[PDB]
């Protein structure tokens, strides 16, 4: 898993696909 | 970027607006009418997506600028839509203004004095004066027209005076003051205005009820029939009209309703649609929400994707061809409609043919702009909205971040024999990474050798740029030609148009150069520092000193690092004086050191500085 991260040149700052996406699932 | 090529003009600001149909028709290089892209034999069909007027394609010269595939920038074309279509991006807005307007007096169902109150507040907000917009609500005298018109006069008087008073001082310019708090106050009002607009059922101007408009996921509007209480209301308020002198609704009917409403309510919409004062004095027209034409992007941005041997059709051309098929079909339907008619009665069929013609072109228009607004086809082709938001988006993947030239990547290896401010560059990278060094009297000796050495001997040169702008590659040349070009580097320019310029030598990366070392993730600016190049012979990996291990958070467990080679002196100075390693001894997080020796050196010091050590 770290070998794939060792070669990939990141587009941005990781990804919010975890708990953050379910927190963003709240409309104003 | 070339320092020999300066630019005198600069973009100071970008203005966002909508393209008018009249505007597109004039700038268009060719009208696209044909759904086919290629004729027989292999030549592009006249009036198709690959027309040579849209730019050079298939080793043919452009029929607009005459240039070939390289120098031709490409040209915009247009598709003439046989019937107007709702622009997908602005459908929600035109829908708000359709539900908010009266179908009889063709004004918003909200009372004129209340509408004027919003227009006043929004005009005062074009200029940076929020306090005055609230002070307008203090201006106060089923109410007579002679009294309400005096309130509109007193409010307009305060607005004109408050603007002029603030304009006299340095409070607001002719172009108007605009801040985030001003923007917050504007956004609040434009929201409140639309909320009050949508809330009214019975028109406050003329007491007649309008039939409610409903909507579906796709761009399509329906008209719900009025109830018997509201139908009798229309009858009793029918005489006052004389003294002054669910069913689908077509795009033309909606445009015609909004046309009159945007004319009759022009005063408020002038400030509803303008963030700052409208100095251009342009009219706010309803046809901005509608599409009577479609711009055809240049062939340059619609080229067929080639993967090895297979040449695949461009997805945009596919979506555009679909719009072209429907347009030809409606042109025939309208032609048959024009033929016949004395015999009618059963007009339920002619409207049914019309509804299909309208909903089909609309879907094809939607599919091209935003696919997630088009009907399901038995994964769909991505629209232009999808193109800008493919994954992270065009802005994130190709603007905020970009793949770069003059850069290298390699596994890092430790090295205590190089300086803490240096990087061990393999000779592989040194013979490929070059800097555009302009030839002068002070460096003619240094560059002559580099030119003789060529692109495979370090310190050499891969290319030489003449003052005329042309490039001379030293790759294929033997020592004899290189020796001749070196004795031609400091020759005076015969041409008066380039006498200012001097030749450039694309010289190998030397031991005096700056490089940007990067170890991902770049969680803090210390993970991207400027290192001094040290070309180490017989090396296949980037050599790094142990003092750098902390800042990069890099362990020599098979880690990879990116090396960037900036190509100008301003970028050099920055990597040597601002982003350089030595200026990153202390982290700005706590002001504590992130540079020091790590293991052998610590154990060595305890032994070396011991009393027993003589």
């Amino acid at each position: 898993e770290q070998s794939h991260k060792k070669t990939k040149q990141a587009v941005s700052y990781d990804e919010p696909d975890e708990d953050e996406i379910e927190t963003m699932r709240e409309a104003e | 970027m070339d320092i020999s090529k300066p630019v005198g003009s600069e973009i100071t600001s970008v203005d966002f607006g909508i393209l008018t149909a009249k505007e597109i028709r004039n700038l268009s290089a060719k009208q696209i009418t044909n759904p086919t892209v290629l004729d027989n034999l292999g030549h592009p069909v006249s009036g198709g997506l690959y027309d040579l007027a849209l730019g050079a394609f298939l080793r043919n010269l452009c029929s607009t600028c005459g240039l070939d595939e390289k120098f031709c920038p490409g040209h915009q074309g247009h598709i003439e839509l046989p019937v107007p279509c709702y622009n997908p991006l602005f459908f929600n807005q035109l829908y708000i203004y359709l539900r908010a307007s009266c179908l009889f007096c063709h004004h918003f169902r909200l009372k004129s004095v209340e509408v004027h109150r919003y227009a006043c507040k929004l005009r005062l907000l074009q200029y940076g004066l929020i306090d005055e917009s609230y002070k307008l609500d203090e201006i106060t005298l089923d109410i007579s027209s002679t009294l309400l018109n005096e309130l509109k006069s007193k409010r307009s008087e305060y607005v004109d005076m408050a603007i002029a008073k603030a304009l006299s001082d340095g409070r607001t310019t002719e172009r108007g003051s605009f801040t985030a708090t001003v923007n917050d106050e504007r956004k609040k009002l434009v929201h409140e205005f639309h909320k009050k607009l949508l809330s009214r059922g019975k028109c406050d101007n003329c007491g007649m009820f309008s039939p409610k408009f409903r909507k579906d996921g796709f761009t399509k509007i329906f008209e719900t029939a009025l109830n018997e209480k509201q139908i009798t209301n229309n009858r009793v308020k029918g005489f006052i009209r004389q003294d002054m002198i669910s069913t689908y609704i077509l795009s033309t009917e909606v445009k015609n309703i909004l046309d009159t409403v945007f004319r009759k309510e022009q005063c408020v919409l002038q400030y509803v649609f303008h963030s700052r004062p409208n100095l251009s004095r342009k009219l706010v027209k309803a046809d901005s929400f509608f599409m009577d034409v479609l711009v055809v992007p240049p062939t340059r941005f619609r080229l067929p994707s080639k993967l090895g041997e297979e040449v695949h059709e461009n997805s945009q051309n596919q979506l555009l061809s679909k719009v072209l098929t429907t347009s030809l079909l409606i042109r025939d339907l309208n032609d048959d409609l024009s033929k016949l008619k004395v015999s009618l009665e059963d007009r339920r069929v002619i409207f049914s043919r019309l509804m299909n013609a309208f909903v089909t072109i609309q879907n094809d228009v939607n599919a091209f702009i935003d696919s997630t607004k088009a009907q399901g086809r038995t994964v769909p082709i991505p629209g232009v909205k999808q193109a800008l938001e493919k994954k992270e988006g065009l802005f994130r993947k190709h603007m905020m971040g970009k793949r770069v030239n003059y850069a290298a990547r390699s596994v890092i290896s430790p090295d205590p024999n190089i300086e803490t401010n240096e990087i061990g560059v393999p000779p592989v990278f040194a013979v490929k990474l070059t800097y555009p060094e302009p030839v002068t009297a002070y460096n003619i000796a240094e560059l002559r050798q580099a030119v003789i050495n060529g692109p495979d001997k370090w310190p050499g040169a891969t290319q030489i740029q003449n003052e005329d702008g042309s490039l001379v590659s030293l790759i294929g040349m033997s020592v004899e030609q290189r020796k001749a070009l070196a004795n031609q580097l400091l020759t005076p320019s015969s041409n008066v148009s380039t006498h200012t310029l001097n030749k450039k030598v694309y010289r190998h990366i030397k031991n005096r150069d700056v490089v940007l070392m990067n170890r991902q993730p770049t969680l803090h600016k210390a993970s991207m520092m400027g290192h001094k190049v040290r070309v180490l012979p017989n090396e296949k990996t980037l050599r790094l000193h142990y003092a750098n291990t902390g800042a990069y958070n890099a362990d020599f467990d098979g880690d990879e690092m990116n090396m960037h080679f900036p190509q100008n002196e301003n970028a050099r100075a920055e990597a040597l004086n601002l982003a350089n390693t030595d200026s990153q001894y202390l982290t700005p997080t706590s002001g504590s050191p992130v540079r020091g020796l790590i293991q052998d050196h610590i154990s060595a010091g305890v032994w070396l500085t011991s009393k027993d050590s003589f």
């Binding site: - | 090529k5 300066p6 630019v7 005198g8 003009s9 008066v496 148009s497 380039t498 200012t500 310029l501």
Partner: protein
């Protein structure tokens, strides 16, 4: 040919053009030719000398 270092970014007439008499043109030509004579400009002075010659004599 047609570059920022060759041609200007913009040229603007600051005022309306004011007509000059035969003697003023000849006085200017004499002043300009003398100042420039004091590489491709030489061919333009050669042509300018012909205008000056026409404004007082015969070719």
């Amino acid at each position: 040919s047609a570059t920022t270092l060759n041609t200007p970014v913009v040229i603007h007439a600051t005022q309306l053009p004011q007509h000059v008499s035969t003697d003023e043109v000849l006085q200017f030509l004499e002043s300009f030719i003398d100042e420039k004579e004091n590489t491709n400009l030489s061919s333009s002075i050669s042509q300018l000398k012909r205008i000056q010659r026409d404004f007082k004599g015969l070719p």
